[PDB]
Design a protein around this ligand. Structure first.
Ligand SMILES: OC[C@H]1O[C@@H](O[C@H]2[C@H](O)[C@@H](O)[C@@H](O)O[C@@H]2CO)[C@H](O)[C@@H](O)[C@H]1O
Ligand SMILES: OC[C@H]1O[C@@H](O[C@H]2[C@H](O)[C@@H](O)[C@@H](O)O[C@@H]2CO)[C@H](O)[C@@H](O)[C@H]1O
Lengths: 134, 133
């Protein structure tokens, strides 16, 4: 499927909202939403949001100097193979609120400063209808 | 039916008000208010007022019983008889209105955010959901 990759050249702020609408393919294994601090794929990640249909988990993490931080997991998997979805990733001063299906799903406290974010990447086993930054 | 719900801990940058519903075929106007309290005539940090009758969307505040100076969004992204989805997003700088998953208008803060303690949705509107994230 077609990944999304777009620049946020001045960072993000409390009140930035990433709105993603799409479809999980019926044979999906995993997909990801990354907020990265650079234009490279090994650059630091303020947020790695990784729904894993194969292992029935949604993992949250950060990455700094090529090392992953402590994983967090959301409660259950609010995605389903074959089904459309709406995700909001909402930046506050304290962290990211992941909203799925118009219900608060998980709160991930920041590890990296919002001002360092430079790139949003959405890829893997996912079909995207829209990716918007508000 | 109107929505009125309390925000016990207030709202902060990163608060999102998500409203989904339908503009009735005979609608005149509806409103979304971010209010400082449960009473009649409370200060309003934000009054978001789509006006089907006059083809405008008015934004304003209210302090000491007096409406402030109105701002107007670009066009009216609502239609009688049609469903809509609105996000009202609080930032450090103001409130961002998103309609139909498109950025619509930005209203810079006038009142301190920490005084907002109530959300009200009323007027000519049928609500499917009101959620605060
Ligand atoms: O932490 C995010 C990264 O996890 C990597 O996989 C982990 C896995 O979650 C864990 O349970 C254990 O098996 O170790 C693995 C490697 O640390 C993913 O490979 C990576 O893409 C991120 O999702
Ligand atoms: O500004 C929000 C309030 O406006 C009131 O309407 C005003 C009108 O927009 C203004 O031009 C004024 O001079 O006359 C009207 C009031 O008599 C609405 O009545 C009120 O509901 C708010 O929307």
């Amino acid at each position: 499927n077609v990944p999304h990759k777009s620049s946020l050249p001045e960072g993000i702020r409390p009140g930035t909202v990433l709105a993603i609408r799409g479809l999980v393919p019926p044979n999906a294994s995993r997909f990801h939403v990354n907020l990265l601090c650079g234009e490279e794929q090994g650059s630091d990640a303020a947020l790695h949001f990784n729904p894993r249909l194969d292992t029935s988990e949604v993992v949250f993490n950060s990455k700094e100097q090529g090392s992953w931080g402590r994983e967090e997991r959301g409660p259950g998997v609010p995605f389903q193979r074959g089904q459309p979805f709406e995700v909001l990733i909402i930046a506050s001063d304290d962290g990211f609120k992941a909203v799925v299906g118009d219900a608060q799903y998980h709160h991930f406290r920041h590890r990296l400063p919002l001002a360092r974010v430079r790139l949003v990447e959405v890829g893997g086993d996912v079909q995207l209808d829209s990716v918007r930054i508000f």
